[PDB]
CSV table of C-alpha atoms (C1' of nucleotides) in Angstrom, one decimal:
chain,number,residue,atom,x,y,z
A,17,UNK,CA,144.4,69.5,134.9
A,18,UNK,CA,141.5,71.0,132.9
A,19,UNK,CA,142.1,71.7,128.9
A,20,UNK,CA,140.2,74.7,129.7
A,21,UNK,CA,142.3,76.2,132.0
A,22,UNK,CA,145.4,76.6,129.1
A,23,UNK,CA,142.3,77.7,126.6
A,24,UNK,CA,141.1,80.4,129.4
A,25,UNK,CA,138.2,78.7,130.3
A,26,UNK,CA,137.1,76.7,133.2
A,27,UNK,CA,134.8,73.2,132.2
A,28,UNK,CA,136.0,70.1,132.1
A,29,UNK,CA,135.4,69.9,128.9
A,30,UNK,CA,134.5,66.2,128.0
A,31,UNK,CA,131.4,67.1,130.6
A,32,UNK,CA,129.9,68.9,127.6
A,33,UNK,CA,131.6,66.3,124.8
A,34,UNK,CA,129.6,63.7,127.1
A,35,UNK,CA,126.7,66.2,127.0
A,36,UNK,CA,126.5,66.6,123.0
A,37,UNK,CA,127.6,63.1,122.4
A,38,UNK,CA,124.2,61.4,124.5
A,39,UNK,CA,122.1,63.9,123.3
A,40,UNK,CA,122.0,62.3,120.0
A,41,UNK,CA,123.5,65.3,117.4
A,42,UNK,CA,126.2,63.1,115.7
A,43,UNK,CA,128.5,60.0,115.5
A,44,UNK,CA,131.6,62.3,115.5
A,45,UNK,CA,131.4,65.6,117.1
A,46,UNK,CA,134.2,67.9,116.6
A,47,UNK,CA,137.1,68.2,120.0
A,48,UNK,CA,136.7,72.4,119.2
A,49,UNK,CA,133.2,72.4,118.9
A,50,UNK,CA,132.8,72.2,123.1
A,51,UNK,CA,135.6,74.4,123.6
A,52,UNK,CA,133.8,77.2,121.8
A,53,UNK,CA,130.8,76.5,122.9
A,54,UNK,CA,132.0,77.3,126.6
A,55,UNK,CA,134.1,80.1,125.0
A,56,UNK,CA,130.4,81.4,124.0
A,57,UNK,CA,129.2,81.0,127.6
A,58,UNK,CA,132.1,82.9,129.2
A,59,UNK,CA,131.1,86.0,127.1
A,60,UNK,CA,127.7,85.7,126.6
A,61,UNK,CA,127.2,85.0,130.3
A,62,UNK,CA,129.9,88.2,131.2
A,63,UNK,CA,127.5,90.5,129.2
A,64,UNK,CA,124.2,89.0,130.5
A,65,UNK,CA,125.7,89.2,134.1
A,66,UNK,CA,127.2,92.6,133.4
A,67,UNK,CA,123.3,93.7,132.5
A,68,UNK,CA,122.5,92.3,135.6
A,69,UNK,CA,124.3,94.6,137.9
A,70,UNK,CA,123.6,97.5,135.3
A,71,UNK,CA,120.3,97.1,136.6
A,72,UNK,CA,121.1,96.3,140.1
A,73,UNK,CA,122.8,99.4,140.5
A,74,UNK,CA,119.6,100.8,138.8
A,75,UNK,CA,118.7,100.6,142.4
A,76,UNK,CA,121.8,100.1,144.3
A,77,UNK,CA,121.4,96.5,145.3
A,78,UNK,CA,124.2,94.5,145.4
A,79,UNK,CA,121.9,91.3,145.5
Q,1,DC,C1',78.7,98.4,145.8
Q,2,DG,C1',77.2,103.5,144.8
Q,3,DC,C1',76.9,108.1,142.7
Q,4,DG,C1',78.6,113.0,140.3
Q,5,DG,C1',80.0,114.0,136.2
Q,6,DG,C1',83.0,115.2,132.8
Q,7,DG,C1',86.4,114.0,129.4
Q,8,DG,C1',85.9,111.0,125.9
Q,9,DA,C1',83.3,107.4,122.5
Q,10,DC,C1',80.3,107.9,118.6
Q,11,DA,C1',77.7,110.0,115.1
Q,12,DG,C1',75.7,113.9,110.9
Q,13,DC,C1',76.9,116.5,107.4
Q,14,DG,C1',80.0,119.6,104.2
Q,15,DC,C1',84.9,119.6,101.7
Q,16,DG,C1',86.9,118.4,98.3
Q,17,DT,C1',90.2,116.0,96.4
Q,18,DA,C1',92.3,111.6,95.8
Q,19,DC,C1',92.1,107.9,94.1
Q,20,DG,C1',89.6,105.3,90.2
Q,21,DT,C1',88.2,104.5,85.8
Q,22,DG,C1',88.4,105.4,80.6
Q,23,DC,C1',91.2,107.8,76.2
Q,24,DG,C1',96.3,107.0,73.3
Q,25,DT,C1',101.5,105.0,73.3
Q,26,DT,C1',105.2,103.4,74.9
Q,27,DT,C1',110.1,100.0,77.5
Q,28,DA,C1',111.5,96.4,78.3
Q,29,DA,C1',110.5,91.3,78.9
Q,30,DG,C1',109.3,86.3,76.5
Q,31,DC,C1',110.5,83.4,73.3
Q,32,DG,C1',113.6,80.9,69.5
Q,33,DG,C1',118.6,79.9,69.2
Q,34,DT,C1',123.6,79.2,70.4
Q,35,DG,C1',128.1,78.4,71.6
Q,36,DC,C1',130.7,77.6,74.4
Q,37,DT,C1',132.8,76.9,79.0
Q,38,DA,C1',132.5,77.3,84.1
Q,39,DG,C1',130.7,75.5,88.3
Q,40,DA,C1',128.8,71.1,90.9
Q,41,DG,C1',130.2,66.5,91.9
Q,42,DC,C1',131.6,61.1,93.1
Q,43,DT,C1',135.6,58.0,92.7
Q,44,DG,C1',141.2,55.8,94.2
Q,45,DT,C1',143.1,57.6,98.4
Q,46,DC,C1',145.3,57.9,102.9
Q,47,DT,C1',145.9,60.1,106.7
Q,48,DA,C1',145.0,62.6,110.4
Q,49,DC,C1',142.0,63.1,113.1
Q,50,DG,C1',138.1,62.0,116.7
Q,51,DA,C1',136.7,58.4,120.9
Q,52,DC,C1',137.8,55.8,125.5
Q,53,DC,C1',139.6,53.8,129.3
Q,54,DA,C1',144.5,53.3,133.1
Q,55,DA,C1',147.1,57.1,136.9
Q,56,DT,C1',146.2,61.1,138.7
Q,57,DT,C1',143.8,65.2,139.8
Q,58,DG,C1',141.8,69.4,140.8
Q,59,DA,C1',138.0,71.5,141.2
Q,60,DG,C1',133.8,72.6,141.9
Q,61,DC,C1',130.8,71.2,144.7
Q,62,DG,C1',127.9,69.4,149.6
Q,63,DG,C1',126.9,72.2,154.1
Q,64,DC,C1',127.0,76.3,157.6
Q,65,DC,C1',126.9,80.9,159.2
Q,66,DT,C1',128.6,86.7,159.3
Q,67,DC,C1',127.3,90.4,158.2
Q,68,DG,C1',127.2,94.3,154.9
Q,69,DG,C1',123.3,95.1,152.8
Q,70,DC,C1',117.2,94.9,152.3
Q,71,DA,C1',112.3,97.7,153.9
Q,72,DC,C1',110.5,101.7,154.9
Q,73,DC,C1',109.1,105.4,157.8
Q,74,DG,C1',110.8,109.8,161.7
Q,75,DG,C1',111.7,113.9,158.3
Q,76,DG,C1',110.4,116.6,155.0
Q,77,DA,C1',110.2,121.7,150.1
Q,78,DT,C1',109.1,120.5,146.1
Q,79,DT,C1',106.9,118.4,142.6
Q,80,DC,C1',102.1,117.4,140.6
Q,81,DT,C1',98.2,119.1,140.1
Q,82,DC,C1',93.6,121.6,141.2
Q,83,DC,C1',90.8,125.7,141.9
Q,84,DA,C1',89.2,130.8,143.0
Q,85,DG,C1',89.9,136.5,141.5
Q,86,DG,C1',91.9,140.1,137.6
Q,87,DG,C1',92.7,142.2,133.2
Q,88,DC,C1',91.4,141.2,129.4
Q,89,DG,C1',90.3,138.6,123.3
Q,90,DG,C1',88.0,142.9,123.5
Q,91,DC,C1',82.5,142.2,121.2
Q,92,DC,C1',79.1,144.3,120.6
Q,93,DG,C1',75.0,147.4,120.5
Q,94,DC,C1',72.5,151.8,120.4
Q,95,DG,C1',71.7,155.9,119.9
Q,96,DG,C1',72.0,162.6,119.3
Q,97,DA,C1',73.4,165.4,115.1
DNA sequence: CGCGGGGGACAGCGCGTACGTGCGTTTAAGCGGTGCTAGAGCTGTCTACGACCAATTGAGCGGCCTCGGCACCGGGATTCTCCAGGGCGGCCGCGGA
């Protein structure tokens, strides 16, 4: 199972340590730094997708 | 591509005042000094704290197909605006005694 699941999150989280670690940031990167990061995209994304249907229902369309 | 035209771009000149420049006299900074002490900082250190692959694993995806929604006119007073008479801002002028 997941670390993100206990966290309340969703990633498999050494997909984004795998991510930051070949993209060439730093020797060590920090285990919390990836959990926040998808903590950020859970909320950034739940407002971003909640402006989305603010203006779909600007013209009542579900799509 | 073409034309009517009319609201809008562009200019000429007066207003006048709004900065602009020349008079004195400041309020507070620059510099010399200082005596300290208060923050910035690497060395023994040592530990905890990150990385990666075995057993599993779940979890989101790879692919289809239903169906409650997309697109907009039948269906249409009102909105949005445009244009012709009426009473009027009155304005104004001119003349008997």
């Amino acid at each position: 199972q997941s670390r993100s699941a206990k966290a309340g999150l969703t990633f498999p989280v050494g997909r984004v340590h795998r991510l930051l670690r070949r993209g060439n940031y730093a020797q060590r990167i920090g285990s919390g730094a990836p959990v926040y990061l998808t903590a950020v995209l859970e909320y950034l994304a739940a407002e971003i997708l909640e402006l989305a249907g603010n203006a779909a229902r600007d013209n009542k369309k579900t799509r």
